[PDB]
Amino acid sequence: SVYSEYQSKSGVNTNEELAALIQYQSSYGAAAKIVSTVDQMLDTLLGLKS
Amino acid sequence: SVYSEYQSKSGVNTNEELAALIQYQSSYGAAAKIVSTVDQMLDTLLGLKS
Amino acid sequence: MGIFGTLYTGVTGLKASEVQIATTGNNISNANATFYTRQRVVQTTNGYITTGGVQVGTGTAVESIVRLHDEYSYYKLKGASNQLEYTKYMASTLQEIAQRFP
Amino acid sequence: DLQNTGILQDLENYNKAWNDFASNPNENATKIALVKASQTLTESVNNTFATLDKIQKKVNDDIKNTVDEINKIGEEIATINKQIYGQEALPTEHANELRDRRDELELTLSKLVSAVASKNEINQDNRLDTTITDPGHQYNLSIEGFSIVDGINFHPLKLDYDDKNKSYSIYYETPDEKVRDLTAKISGGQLGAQLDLRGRNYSKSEGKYEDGIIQGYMDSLDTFAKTMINETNNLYASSAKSSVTSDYLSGLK
Amino acid sequence: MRITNKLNFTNSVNNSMGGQSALYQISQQLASGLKIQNSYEDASTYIDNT
Amino acid sequence: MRITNKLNFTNSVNNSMGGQSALYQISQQLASGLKIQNSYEDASTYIDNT
Amino acid sequence: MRITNKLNFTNSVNNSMGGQSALYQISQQLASGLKIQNSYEDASTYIDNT
Amino acid sequence: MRITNKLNFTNSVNNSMGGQSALYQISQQLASGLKIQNSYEDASTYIDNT
Amino acid sequence: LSVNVQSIKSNVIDVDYGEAMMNLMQVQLAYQASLKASTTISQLSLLNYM
């Protein structure tokens, strides 16, 4: 029983690991796109005065 | 009779739901391609502006 | 809708798909919610254009989620659930009695 | 309906005892069990009536439930038209869609029954702004032999079940040096269904909504009950008693 | 598909169990060779017997 | 055709729903082993057999 | 919904964890071969059992 | 849930061993044909009947 | 008399393994579907980021 209750919430569970694994990957991607989108402004910014 | 009365008109069942999602997938995907197309129009606009 | 106008509108349609998807996934989760009903969503549209004849309005927008059925059908069967308790408990009771002096 | 669905076997149960009680005319145990079983059989008749009676009741209730559900639909639909309009004319693009969902509501009237409205020629361009947006030419509606229905509103139709005897009753009123009631030749897919089945005219004299398809079935049900009521009365009347003293019956000079 | 239906095929196995036992009593009747074995099973057979 | 397109998916469901009901309807015979199990199916055969 | 989409990647697991509990919850009933094993699965039965 | 994963299958095996041995034991009591087989099982029976 | 209560006692607690096994299938099949449905959504979440 005292086993079971640590087991109830303690270490590793596939869908938990899988879900966050996907999420950050998506998060890592959303950031990459927008940051490159920032980069495109550097160009626009420079162009403003270029 | 009453025993029956929780799984054909109103209270929870599978086959109805599993199919319904598919249309949203298609509609979702169609919308996804649609907006990405708009990006091209934004591009054309910027180009003419230049 | 404008240029930006068309831009969100298509987005909102995709967002509505998400909402439709969200509802369905819950219903999928509700598959064993043995006390759950049908809640489903609606849609609407926004903006204006002009040539005579009618009223005008355009775009995409979401509208609330609702449920309704034969409410009393539940009442109908609830009355039955009452007396099933009445009989089943009695039936078990008599079998107990019968066992006393078989 | 299946073998042993109570009533069928109950008569046999009723007669199974007569075989033994005929075999043993002094065994009160048969009488005791038989009397109860038959009493249960009578309950089933009591229950079956209450089952059907109650179904017919809710069916009757469905008219009030129905009436209510659709009257709001009645005003809701007419209200929708209001929105179409104005003290001036408008642009063609969207009320087109406004109609359609409001149109399937007219289909709901078909669902229930049916109703129709006129469509014809108008113009919707200003050049001086002295203009209107308007229902009638494109919507004024008729129903079930009556034909006055408003472009924009619901109108004073009602049902109420008295206060003493307290049973249903329906009414209408009108302005044009004429005031008569609601009940047209009403029918419909649902609307006729409810009317047809429940009992459609009302014989206050009978205290009865006379005809009914369900109601007639109950009348036939009782047509069964009374007949067999007499016959076992006949046969049990054949039994011997030290006194006979009648039921107490009206007008019986 | 959510008020009348999906439950009943859940019943059928339950009902199958109802027959499953019912068969067993019948087997007991055949194994015993006796009409009935408890009070509520036939009053006549009881009255006749008793 | 076109607005059939979104309703067409629904018919596929409607077609799917029919088989779901159809297979269930067969199940009545599977549980019962009888031609039919309820009155509305054929009044006469019940009637006559009674 | 906007942030809910963050919660939803959890809700996927959250809904999953419900079934995760159930399957095992059955398993101990399978392993126990009993309707119930806890006092609070059905006390009325449990008190009756005792 | 989580380290429940890590042992629940292990626990099932643990559960299986106990049941396996118990059944395997009763197989022994059958093979011997005695209600018990050793002192530590029901001493009074073992000693008194000895 | 003891035999009567012995069975009765069991029946109060008795679990039908076949019935429960099917009920496991009911949830077990469903849980599979919801799992994929969750996956489908997860993929749907990622792909649109084009």
HEC profile of chain D: CCCCCCHHHHHHHHHHHHHHHHHCCCCHHHHHHHHHHHHHHHHHHHHHHHHHHHHHHHHHHHHHHHHHHHHHHHHHHHHHHHHHCECCCCECCCHHHHHHHHHHHHHHHHHHCCCEECCCCCCCCCCCCCCCECCHHHCCEEECCECCCCCCCCCCEEECCCCCCCCCCEEECCCCCCCCCCCCCCCCCCHHHHHHHHCCCCECCCCECCCCHHHHHHHHHHHHHHHHHHHHHHHHHCCCCCCCCCCCCCCCC
Which residues have CB under 8 Å from E6's CB, separation 6+?
B7, B8, B12, B13, B14
Q: What is the DSSP string of E7-33?
A: HHHHHHHHHHHHHHHHHHHHHHHHHHT
The position carrying tokens 């269904």 is D193
The strand pairing partners of C43, in sequence order, are C62
User: Three-state SS for B41?
Assistant: helix
In angstroms, what CA-CA distances link D191 with D56, D59, D145, D200?
15, 12, 14, 11
Selected for mutation to probe chain C from B16, B18, B22, B24 (highest C CB count within 10 Å) is B24
Which residues have CB under 8 Å from D196's CB, separation 6+?
D187, D213
Chain F residues with CB under 8 Å of B16 CB are 13, 17
Selected for mutation to probe chain C from G2, G8, G10 (highest C CB count within 10 Å) is G8
Neighbours of I1 (CB within 10 A): 9
User: Three-state SS for C41?
Assistant: strand
B5 contacts E2? CB cut-off 8 A? no
User: Three-state SS for E42?
Assistant: coil
Q: What tokens does C41 get? A: 């969503």
DSSP letter assigned to residue B3: G
Handedness of CA D233, D234, D239, D242 (dihedral sign): positive
E9 contacts F24? CB cut-off 8 A? yes
**What is the rounded CA–CA span in Å between residue B40 and residue D72?**
49
Residue H2 in contact with residue A9, Cβ under 8 Å? yes
Residue E44 in contact with residue D20, Cβ under 8 Å? yes
Looking at the complex, report in whole angstroms how far the Cα of residue D178 sits from the nearest Cα belonging to chain C: 37
Catalogue the long-range contacts made by H45-50 (C-beta closer than 8 Å, 24 or more residues apart).
Answer: none
F interface toward B at CB cutoff 8 Å? 6, 9-10, 12-13, 16-17, 20
The answer, for F14 touching chain E at a CB cutoff of 8 Å, is no
**What is the rounded CA–CA span in Å between residue E7 and residue E12?**
9
Handedness of CA F33, F38, F41, F46 (dihedral sign): positive
Q: What tokens does B23 get? A: 């249309």
User: Three-state SS for F1?
Assistant: coil
Report the amino acid identity of residue D47: N
In angstroms, what CA-CA distances link F38 with A31, D70, E18, F34?
63, 34, 20, 10
The answer, for B44 touching chain C at a CB cutoff of 8 Å, is no
H interface toward A at CB cutoff 8 Å? 1-8
G12 contacts A22? CB cut-off 8 A? no
| Model resolution, angstroms | 6.5
**What is the rounded CA–CA span in Å between residue D113 and residue H49?**
91
- For D14, the closest chain E residue by CA position comes to E44
Selected for mutation to probe chain I from G5, G10, G29, G46 (highest I CB count within 10 Å) is G29
Chains that touch D (3 or more CB pairs under 8 A): C, E, F
The position carrying tokens 């007569």 is D18
Q: How many CB pairs below 8 Å do chains D and F form together?
A: 4
I40 contacts B18? CB cut-off 8 A? no
- For B19, the closest chain F residue by CA position comes to F13
Q: What tokens does E22 get? A: 């019912």
Looking at the complex, report in whole angstroms how far the Cα of residue C97 sits from the nearest Cα belonging to chain I: 12
Chain C residues with CB under 8 Å of G19 CB are 32
In angstroms, what CA-CA distances link D177 with C96, D160, F9?
77, 25, 57
Burial C27-54 (b: 16+ CB within 10 A, else e): bbbbbeeeebebeeeeeeeeeeeeeebb
- For C32, the closest chain I residue by CA position comes to I27
Closest CA to H1 of D26, D50, C74, G14: G14
Report the amino acid identity of residue D160: D
Which residues have CB under 8 Å from G42's CB, separation 6+?
G35, G36
**What is the rounded CA–CA span in Å between residue C83 and residue C28?**
33
Looking at the complex, report in whole angstroms how far the Cα of residue D70 sits from the nearest Cα belonging to chain F: 27
Let me know if chains G and H touch, i.e. at least 3 Cβ pairs under 8 angstroms: yes
Closest CA to I46 of D11, C42, G22, A19: A19
Which residues have CB under 8 Å from C46's CB, separation 6+?
C1, C9, C57, C58, C59, C60, C61
DSSP letter assigned to residue A48: H
Chain E residues with CB under 8 Å of D29 CB are 43, 47
Report the amino acid identity of residue B47: G
Burial D129-157 (b: 16+ CB within 10 A, else e): eebebbbeebbebebbebeebbbbebeeb
Neighbours of A48 (CB within 10 A): 8
The position carrying tokens 């967002």 is C15
- For I38, the closest chain C residue by CA position comes to C25
